[PDB]
Amino acid sequence: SIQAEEWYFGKITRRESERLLLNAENPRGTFLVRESETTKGAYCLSVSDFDNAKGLNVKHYKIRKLDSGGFYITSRTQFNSLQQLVAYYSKHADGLCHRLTTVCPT
Template identity: 30%
Template sequence: MAAALPVCYHGAMTKKECEDLLGKKNKDGAYLIRDSETIQGAMCLCVYKQKVVYTYRLLQSHNGYYTLLTAGGLDETFFKTIDDLIRHYKRKNQGLAMHLRHSVKRKTALLIQPQRELQAQPSKSPEQRPHYENVMQHLLHFEFSLKK
């Protein structure tokens, strides 16, 4: 059975919808988690600071641990649950533009099974299983494409 997702998880939400919602909250350190629009199976941790929304990729490794892609040069830290990750980033000076302070909770129940829970189910062959490394390849390709 998949772990419960935190109430700050909003599922499928566009970047614009996220920015609007965090902007209405208008509090530095307001945050939510949404599905990535560009990387299948990844999520985004979005944090509001001084009218700007900072977005960090939230990835799950092949062994089920979670990590954030933060500022370059910082060591990757892995967490057993998303709640553990959130607790860690509530502390100051952990690599985010602003530490997490105000969870923006979803107002409605999620009616469909999140995509990453579907992917976590056993697949027929190792090639079909999602891997953290595969997500990283897509992310690096996407970032490279943006630089062109």
Template identity: 30%
Template sequence: MEFPFFHGKISRKACEDLLCKKGKNGSYLIRESETVAGALCLCVLFEKVIYTYRIFREYEGCYKVQTSEGVPQKVFKTLKDLIYNYEKPNQGLVTKLRYPVKKTSSSRRSQRFKTGNDDIYDEIDESDYVDVLS
């Protein structure tokens, strides 16, 4: 399954530029974290500010969004489930996810998640994720 809002290894600055260009509250994309190996970042625009939420893949294969201490964590079987949940209001994000910022055709490059013993994505069935940008 391809996620058109997954931008792979783009910089925080490039992410901010894309979201600001969209300019609508609730615009979002997912990118790879620049600072935490194996983590993804859900980046959301609200009131001209970009909010970034880290997504971690657990060894069981489930996804969770990093929360503040004391806030219950939600666990999702797939990224699609995670996005679907946060498209609803009052789920813990600054605003609900409304407008996916899709990767542009000029920047598309086919690449599968790397596999290896130290890779957080080892347990992903490649049929779930077809094309990814780096």
């Protein structure tokens, strides 16, 4: 159950995800998964990042879920569950601004 996941914030807004992620104490990769405001059946993986050009900032990636069961950000790299996807991206940055590190604090 995704709702059982501590990183699953469910129905929170994009502005709220940014308010929570834009905390100076959050290292790069602080993240949360929420429902997308625009795409029904898709979620957003909101991630914090930091660099000297943009300072602390947030990126939002769309996570799709197929009826065929896979979950993915890029269709070329799919997972049997949202949990597996989070685990994979916690170990590989790939196209993300940073690999997922810890759950965002409220």
